[PDB]
Amino acid sequence: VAQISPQYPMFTVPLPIPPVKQPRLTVTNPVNGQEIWYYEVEIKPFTHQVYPDLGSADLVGYDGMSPGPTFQVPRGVETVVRFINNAEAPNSVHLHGSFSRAAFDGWAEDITEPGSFKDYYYPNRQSARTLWYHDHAMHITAENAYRGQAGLYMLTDPAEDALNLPSGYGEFDIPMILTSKQYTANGNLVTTNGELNSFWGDVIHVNGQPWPFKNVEPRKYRFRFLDAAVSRSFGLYFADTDAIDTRLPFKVIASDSGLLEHPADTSLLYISMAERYEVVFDFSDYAGKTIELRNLGGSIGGIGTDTDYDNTDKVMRFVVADDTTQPDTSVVPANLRDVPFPSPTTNTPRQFRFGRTGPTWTINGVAFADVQNRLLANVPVGTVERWELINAGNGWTHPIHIHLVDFKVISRTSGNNARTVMPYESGLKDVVWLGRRETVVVEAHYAPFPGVYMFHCHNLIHEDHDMMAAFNATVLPDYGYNATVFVDPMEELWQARPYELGEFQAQSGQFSVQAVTERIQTMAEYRPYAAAD
């Protein structure tokens, strides 16, 4: 299909790397004496010159950038992140991949208005993995994320550094955040407002930049792919520009929830919205060559229904030097980790159908706006349940996301006989792609925290109109652990608060060292994550 956005100078701008986000300070947790890292992020509009010869684009992002800055937090270190809304529409921050308490999880209605902020208390006790934080405000999640509110959150673990994977953020360990946008004739963004089917986009970006290039050395690199697009799913392959007909093999080492048990040799990677895979690619064998990262055509080989345009088959280019500066010491071990799978169950799976009810995208016929019916499941905390995710259509696909949990992919049947479970789906995941006429079964441990949580399709257009629902991970009233103040996402205790801009810029008032200290220490005393010990 003919490209609609104006022509871009392909592969002329180097791949940008989002800067590491540093904490402002640390507060000592009164309960155990340990340091909690405290950060401040300001949500605000900014201008970005995307087409060198046209006008600029109007974005809104964390700290005035897109992607937002990258967090790097070691397991065991609790963090508190104060997201300050200084924009012109409401926000709700969701750290995807983290078992946060309900009121810190970005519940769609748990909104912060302009002129307010909300403090998020993150546990960071889970396995090393690439998380990402992004907006979740009800009915406007698509435009908010699209205009720039998304960013990386790397949970790290020293035992994992002992594997000696390629390393160094921005050196040999490179984030690859894919988006897919559309631009107007004067180089501004085309809004998603009005789109009720899917917003495909015809200009592919990596890390905020359309069709970038990167100079690389002939050695191993670790790539952290994240499909951050509104609606576009990808089929990823590498190919020499001289032989685009031939796929260069590589290794997948991680999925949503962390490392696989063993590296999976792949030459084609399906990745859908909200999905994260880490890949090690070996440029050794291609010294002097240019490698193109490409995108499978025909709506991802017939798995999807995405529209393909003139240039959406291309992602970026890697120009490989003749030699390395220093010798590649890194390795990709055959054994990565023991994957902590849920204790298996064979209780009949709970069925969910993702489809259409009139003009609305629904889950078992309900829309999220329907407060009285959106709570589709009660699961006692500590329970393992299989869920059967069903897409009976050929006209839509749905990457399904379940909050709180990590899950194992049990099976996939395609009505088009297209595929089953992939080798890179061998580990633990929190989003799984239901392609054309696929039903997938997943197995998750609903643990270890009680609360009301979302689950939905991560096609943001579908999500907003209105393919989202809720589940309750329940406990008995004698459970304790302050469950009473942590189960309801709208719990007033944790709601947003107004601030004055002078206070924020002067780092005084609610933003003074002492006030931040007292507030965090008080949150801490509630001991929200103690059940994870």
Ligand X SMILES: *[C@@H]1O[C@H](CO)[C@@H](O[C@@H]2O[C@H](CO)[C@@H](O)[C@H](O)[C@H]2NC(C)=O)[C@H](O)[C@H]1NC(C)=O
Binder among 483, 496, 520, 531 for ligand X (CB under 6 A): 483
> What are the C-alpha distances in Å from 320 to residues 14, 17, 282, 439?
14, 18, 11, 41
Q: Which residue lies nearer to ligand X by CB, 212 or 528?
A: 528
The answer to whether 247 and 239 have CB atoms below 8 angstroms apart is: yes
Q: Which does 376 bind (CB under 5 to 8 A by kind): ligand X, Cu ion, none?
A: none
96 burial (CB, 10 Å; 0-12 / 13-18 / 19+) is buried
In the block, which residue shows the tokens 């930049």?
209
- Minimum CB distance to ligand X, residue 498 (Å): 23
Binding-site size, ligand X (CB under 6 A): 18
Q: Which residue lies nearer to Cu ion by CB, 221 or 234?
A: 234
Q: Is 255 in the site for ligand X (CB under 6 A)?
A: no
- Minimum CB distance to ligand X, residue 110 (Å): 13
- Annotated binding residues for Cu cation, written as ranges, equal 94, 96, 134, 136, 398, 401, 403, 456-458, 462, 467
The DSSP call for residue 422 is -
Q: Which does 459 bind (CB under 5 to 8 A by kind): ligand X, Cu ion, none?
A: Cu ion
Which of 392, 396, 522, 374 lies closest to 459, judged by CA? 396
How far, in Å, CA of 438 to CA of 417, rounded? Answer: 9
**CB-based contacts of 281, cutoff 8 Å, min separation 6:** 220, 221, 223, 238, 248, 250, 251
- Minimum CB distance to Cu ion, residue 233 (Å): 10
Q: Is 519 in the site for ligand X (CB under 6 A)?
A: no
The count of other CB atoms within 10 Å of the CB of residue 181 is 24
Q: Which residue lies nearer to Cu ion by CB, 231 or 330?
A: 231
Q: Which does 457 bind (CB under 5 to 8 A by kind): Cu ion, ligand X, none?
A: Cu ion
Window contacting ligand X (CB under 6 A); options: 116-124, 201-209, 424-432, 521-529: 521-529
The answer to whether 173 and 225 have CB atoms below 8 angstroms apart is: no
**CB-based contacts of 432, cutoff 8 Å, min separation 6:** 389, 399, 400, 407, 409, 425, 440, 442
- Minimum CB distance to ligand X, residue 475 (Å): 5
Q: Is 489 in the site for ligand X (CB under 6 A)?
A: no
Binder among 59, 472, 504, 529 for ligand X (CB under 6 A): 472
The answer to whether 439 and 389 have CB atoms below 8 angstroms apart is: yes
Is omega for the bond preceding 67 within 30 degrees of 0, making it cis?
yes
Q: Which residue lies nearer to ligand X by CB, 201 or 450?
A: 450
Q: Is 79 left (phi over 0), alpha (psi -120 to 50) or beta?
A: beta
Q: Which does 398 bind (CB under 5 to 8 A by kind): Cu ion, ligand X, none?
A: Cu ion
Q: Is 452 in the site for ligand X (CB under 6 A)?
A: yes
For the record, the structure tokens of 396 come out as 């839509």
How far, in Å, CA of 113 to CA of 177, rounded? Answer: 27
- Minimum CB distance to ligand X, residue 454 (Å): 12
Q: Is 177 in the site for ligand X (CB under 6 A)?
A: no
| Residue type for position 519 | R
- Minimum CB distance to ligand X, residue 354 (Å): 22
How far, in Å, CA of 93 to CA of 41, rounded? Answer: 11
- Minimum CB distance to ligand X, residue 30 (Å): 6
Strands 213-216 and 203-206, by their bridges, are unpaired
Binder among 19, 395, 480, 498 for ligand X (CB under 6 A): 480
Q: Which does 274 bind (CB under 5 to 8 A by kind): Cu ion, ligand X, none?
A: Cu ion
Q: Is 477 in the site for ligand X (CB under 6 A)?
A: yes
Quick note: the x/- pattern for ligand X over 9-48, rule CB under 6 A, is ----------------------x-----------------
Please give the residue ranges that form the binding site for Cu ion (CB under 5 A). 96, 274, 398, 403, 454, 457, 459, 462
Binder among 29, 156, 482, 521 for ligand X (CB under 6 A): 482
Binder among 46, 286, 341, 481 for ligand X (CB under 6 A): 481
Q: Is 474 in the site for ligand X (CB under 6 A)?
A: yes
Partners of 46 in the beta sheet? 59
The answer to whether 92 and 137 have CB atoms below 8 angstroms apart is: yes
Strands 35-48 and 57-62, by their bridges, are antiparallel
Q: Is 80 in the site for ligand X (CB under 6 A)?
A: no
SS3 state at 153:
strand
- Minimum CB distance to Cu ion, residue 397 (Å): 7
What stretches of 115-177 show up as alpha helix (H) in DSSP? Answer: 141-146, 158-161
Q: Which residue lies nearer to ligand X by CB, 329 or 495?
A: 495
Q: Which residue lies nearer to ligand X by CB, 219 or 374?
A: 374
Q: Which residue lies nearer to Cu ion by CB, 108 or 381?
A: 108
Which of 238, 229, 245 lies closest to 463, judged by CA? 229
The count of other CB atoms within 10 Å of the CB of residue 532 is 12
What residue ranges bind ligand X (CB under 6 A)? 31, 375, 450, 452, 472, 474-475, 477, 480-484, 487, 525-527, 530
